[PDB]
C-alpha cells in the first residue's frame, strides 16, 4: 500500500513525479513534441493552397469531403485543410493565401473525414463565412 | 444640475498674485499675455545651434 511514514516525504514526492508520465495528457504537454507539429504550438497559421482535393468520407458514411493541401508559410510544412459549408471550395483557388485553424479536437481527426485535423478560416484575407453569406467578396477580378 | 463646486483664491494684492500665481492662471484673468511657441521647433533649434561655436550660434538659421 501507500507509504505513510512522517519521514517519507521524499519518496512520495518522487513517486508521483515518475507516475505523472504515465498520464497521456501530462506527457503530451511536457514531452516537447508539440513544437514539432505543423502549427508549432500556434492557434492559427497562414499557408499557400497547393491543390484542391477531395477525400472519401469514412464508413458508414459515403461522400467526398472537399479539402485543400496547404503549405505553411512559416515552416513550409504541407497539411490537409477541410473546407466547410456547401460550395465554399469554389471560393478557393490554387496558390492562394489561406488562414488555417484546428478542427476542434486539439490535433485529432474529427468526424468521418480521415486524417484531417485542420480547417480553412480565411481565403485571400476574407473569412469563408462572409463569402458563404455573401457579406463580402474576394479581392480580385 | 443645480449645483457646482470649485476652488477659489483671494490674494491681498495683484502684485502678490503675480509672484505666486502660475502663469496660465494669470492669462485667464488677463493679467498676462500668452507667448506662442512650438516646443518641437525649439528642440530642433537647440540641436542645430550646438553644432556651431562662438557668436555664430545665434545666427545659425
Amino acid at each position: 500500500g501507500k507509504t505513510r511514514g512522517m519521514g517519507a516525504g521524499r519518496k512520495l514526492k518522487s513517486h508521483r513525479r515518475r507516475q505523472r508520465w504515465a498520464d497521456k495528457s501530462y506527457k503530451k504537454s511536457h514531452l516537447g513534441n508539440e513544437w514539432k507539429k505543423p502549427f508549432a504550438g500556434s492557434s492559427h497559421a497562414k499557408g499557400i493552397v497547393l491543390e484542391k482535393i477531395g477525400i472519401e468520407a469514412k464508413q458508414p458514411n459515403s461522400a467526398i469531403r472537399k479539402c485543400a493541401r496547404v503549405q505553411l508559410i512559416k515552416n513550409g510544412k504541407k497539411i490537409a485543410a477541410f473546407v466547410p459549408n456547401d460550395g465554399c471550395l469554389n471560393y478557393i483557388e490554387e496558390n492562394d493565401e489561406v488562414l488555417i485553424a484546428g478542427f476542434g479536437r486539439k490535433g485529432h481527426a474529427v468526424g468521418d473525414i480521415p486524417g484531417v485535423r485542420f480547417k480553412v478560416v480565411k481565403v485571400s484575407g476574407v473569412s469563408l463565412l462572409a463569402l458563404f453569406k455573401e457579406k463580402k467578396e474576394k479581392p480580385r477580378s | 444640475g443645480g449645483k457646482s463646486t470649485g476652488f477659489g483664491l483671494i490674494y491681498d494684492s495683484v502684485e502678490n498674485a503675480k509672484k505666486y500665481e502660475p502663469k496660465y492662471r494669470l492669462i485667464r484673468n488677463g493679467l498676462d499675455t500668452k507667448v506662442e511657441k512650438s516646443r518641437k521647433q525649439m528642440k530642433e533649434r537647440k540641436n542645430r545651434a550646438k553644432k556651431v561655436r562662438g557668436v555664430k550660434k545665434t545666427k545659425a538659421g
Binding site: 484542391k52 482535393i53 477531395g54 477525400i55 472519401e56 467526398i64 472537399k66 456547401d86 460550395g87 465554399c88 471550395l89 469554389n90 | -
Partner: protein, 48 residues
C-alpha cells in the same frame, strides 16, 4: 474524388426572399412579453 459537384444542392435550391415584418421589442421590453407569454397566458413551437 470528383470536385465538380461542389455547391450542387445550394445552387439548386430556389431563392425565396424573406418577408419583412414588424420588429420585436428589445431588451427589457422583450423580456416583458416573454414573461407574459409563459406565466400570464404543447411546446412553444408546436405545429398545432
Amino acid at each position: 474524388g470528383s470536385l465538380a459537384r461542389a455547391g450542387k444542392v445550394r445552387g439548386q435550391t430556389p431563392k425565396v426572399a424573406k418577408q419583412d415584418k414588424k420588429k420585436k421589442p428589445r431588451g427589457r421590453a422583450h423580456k416583458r412579453m416573454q414573461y407574459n407569454r409563459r406565466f400570464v397566458t404543447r411546446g412553444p413551437n408546436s405545429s398545432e
